[PDB]
Ligand binder design. Structure first.
Ligand code: HEM
Ligand code: HEM
Ligand SMILES: O=[N+]([O-])c1ccc2[nH]ncc2c1
Ligand SMILES: O=[N+]([O-])c1ccc2[nH]ncc2c1
Ligand SMILES: [Zn+2]
Lengths: 400, 400
């Protein structure tokens, strides 16, 4: 009854006993697999399970304190339809959410997460202050530290706190008259929203977007991150001298801000989190995706490669050097970064740790395997089981 | 409801309506996805469906001929417990089996498959002759032609025709006394079986294995493939002059021979098929997999790369040149080969053709996306739906 999981490189076998405890249902059915696709009593049920997880984590399950807590949660929901998490439970829940994220390859670090409690936040201005403090702590002058800031939970009588931006730091995307885009094409919508809301735009390829912050039942407010808080890295190549002349750069801090944090049935629509970059996301996805900066052809031409035929593998060669540049540049500027080989190796260790700890680990193979050199990394040869566990980070509709 | 399928590079959307016709069930459930895992009345229902597919294909569904055929099959099953396919149906069925294979990126050529009827095969010796003929026809001195040879179907009260080898052409794998393996580690088991049956083993890294052919209720017979029949390609690099000295080589013809062909409830345990190679399978998987030839480090050392740290991307760089070597060598030897960029590009066209033809296309994302430079290809950005349609090629247990 338990899924057999095999590693085809070494031949080792394991059984996922944790999958049987999946709290929610995925998109797949026996008739067809949809794994490649990107996207009252129910509250109490999830609440009780979470409390059980918490007390089990501190080795006090079945204790008087455990039973008391279960009764309090039940009492609060009966009277208000919701409940208040204790500080220690929020911290525990935030870590479990990261731990449970199937698409995250950096989970070996799940236990080291700084949790900022912003549940007392009352306005967009205070939300901005909290965000700036998160960025400063997380950036730590280049020695990045994982962190999450949790804003007030969704509740019955009012709207939600929301960060409109997809990440705390993103580059603007300006649609040009000729039909092209200057900057990040992925950010055209949010850029136009900022402009619509009062922001006079810049005209560069790497303009840091302002934050569009939303307090309950109020229109979003624009806030500009002090440049001194946004650490960036100029891109250069160790041997290709002309690379530095391209004027490319990227930001140090990858901070997702559009996901919803779910803990024991409670929902936190605004809870930005951050870690550090795995080089392929910048070097391969952000810079080489055809619908992103799309610099592959230009770099190849500068490398004097034959772009006439696909068989010369000019695309592969250019992509590799761009990734080399990203890694070399971050190391030079002393900003935390991890290559795909080192990251996937650490994930294999994580799988081992979790097998012993909980008898399995929800993992999304398509997202775990890096965008380049897939089969050269250990995770490629590792079968995985994908399932939804709670606490969890979930996608949610854009506020507009 | 029909699954909504999106391409994230372009933004186009389609609905897979074909998946509702999935005759068999997969390993996934709403509880968990297992997409990354490698592995009388019922006969009539499958037979009728297939016959219906056949008459629909020639635009004569509902005809007297269609009805007479359905009745003919029913009568044959009532009298013998099984039935026989007409030659035209066999051809159609084999082509559909390829068309329906979710893990095959080369399906745009499905309609051009050349099907050879070997159902009159009486012995292992006749089987060998059929196999040699297939090899000569398919290899065609380098100008490869897709083809399949179908041997007698499985029937009650009689053993099965089986080809013990996984492919018609495989390199021996010799386990050395010191624990290492000389040759292809993937072929250790079959090599030892060939030795046990009377084969005099060689001692090279690229020794073409003999065929272990099984006739109904007979022990497997050993057969040596005439060397002039096995076209091979010596590997060299266009700029790295020392690459040729490594003495690497690979065969021209990729001919899978251990899969079972299922058509309308009938099973053909022996039905070897072949096409032509996509470069990454040789350059990345066969030569660079840790559990295969594992030549990555040796090549990186010869390239004078810093193998001390992972961040220099020495593995990625070596892997790219190995793939360049494969492509260059096959093109030089004038043997059909397709790079991963051209292959994935053609698959996107195949998906387009299929959407219009059948309203969908069963595809396994994890297998369609190449082992290197995934995101650099269009298929990476394409959501897919995986399901089992029949006719089909299925895995089957080893005869031993
Ligand atoms: C510490 C370093 C970390 C590394 C190297 C890492 C790396 C990654 C990578 C490679 C992905 C896929 C990114 C993409 O394709 O967009 C990812 C996804 C994800 N990560 Fe991690 N991560 C780290 C920290 C964190 C932290 C601190 C959290 C949460 C507290 C987290 C939560 C997630 C989630 C929820 C996803 C899925 C995002 C989605 O579905 O779009 N990660 N991470
Ligand atoms: C014409 C050129 C062809 C190309 C470039 C091609 C390419 C591929 C590739 C890259 C794979 C997956 C990787 C692997 O082999 O392990 C594959 C799998 C497969 N191909 Fe194709 N193929 C071709 C022709 C054919 C033909 C003629 C048939 C059958 C009539 C076929 C049947 C299959 C099947 C059933 C699989 C799944 C194999 C498995 O599960 O291990 N292919 N092919
Ligand atoms: O999702 N994330 O927060 C996240 C964290 C770290 C990362 N490195 N590279 C991509 C990436 C994404
Ligand atoms: O399935 N096949 O016969 C087949 C055909 C062509 C191929 N290229 N690379 C792998 C591969 C497999
Ligand atoms: Zn699935």
């Amino acid at each position: 009854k338990f899924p057999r999981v095999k590693n085809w490189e070494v031949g080792s076998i394991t059984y996922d006993t944790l999958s049987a405890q999946a709290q929610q249902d995925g998109p797949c059915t026996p008739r067809r697999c949809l794994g490649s696709l990107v996207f009252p009593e129910q509250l109490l049920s999830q609440a009780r399970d979470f409390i059980n997880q918490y007390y089990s984590s501190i080795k006090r399950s079945g204790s008087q304190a455990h039973e008391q807590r279960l009764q309090e949660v039940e009492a609060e929901v009966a009277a208000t339809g919701t409940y208040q998490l204790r500080e220690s439970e929020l911290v525990f829940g935030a870590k479990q959410a990261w731990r449970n994220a199937p698409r995250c390859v950096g989970r070996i670090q799940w236990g080291k997460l700084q949790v900022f409690d912003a549940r007392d936040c009352r306005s967009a201005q205070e939300m901005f202050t909290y965000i700036c403090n998160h960025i400063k702590y997380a950036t730590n002058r280049g020695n990045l530290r994982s962190a999450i800031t949790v804003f007030p939970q969704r509740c019955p009588g009012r709207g939600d706190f929301r960060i409109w931006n997809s990440q705390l730091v993103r580059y603007a995307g300006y649609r040009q008259q000729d039909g092209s885009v200057r900057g990040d094409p992925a950010n055209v919508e949010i850029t136009e929203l900022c402009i619509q809301h009062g922001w006079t735009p810049g005209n560069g390829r790497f303009d840091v977007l302002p934050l569009l912050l939303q307090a309950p039942d109020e229109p979003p407010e624009l806030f500009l991150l002090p440049p001194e808080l946004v650490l960036e890295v100029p891109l250069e190549h160790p041997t290709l001298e002309w690379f530095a002349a391209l004027g490319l750069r990227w930001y140090a801090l990858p901070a997702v801000s559009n996901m919803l944090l779910e803990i024991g049935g409670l929902e936190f629509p605004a809870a930005p989190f951050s870690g550090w970059y795995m080089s392929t996301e910048i070097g391969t996805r952000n810079l080489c995706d055809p619908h992103r900066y799309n610099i592959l052809e230009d770099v190849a031409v500068c490398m004097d490669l034959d772009t006439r035929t696909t068989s010369s593998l000019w695309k592969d060669k250019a992509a590799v050097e761009i990734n080399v540049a990203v890694l070399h540049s971050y190391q030079l500027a002393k900003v935390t970064i991890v290559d795909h080989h080192a990251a996937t190796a650490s994930f294999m260790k994580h799988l081992e740790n979790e097998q012993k700890a909980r008898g399995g680990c929800p993992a999304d193979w398509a997202w775990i395997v890096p965008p380049i050199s897939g089969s050269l990394t250990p995770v490629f040869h590792q079968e995985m089981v994908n399932y939804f566990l709670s606490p969890a980070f979930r996608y949610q509709p854009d506020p507009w």
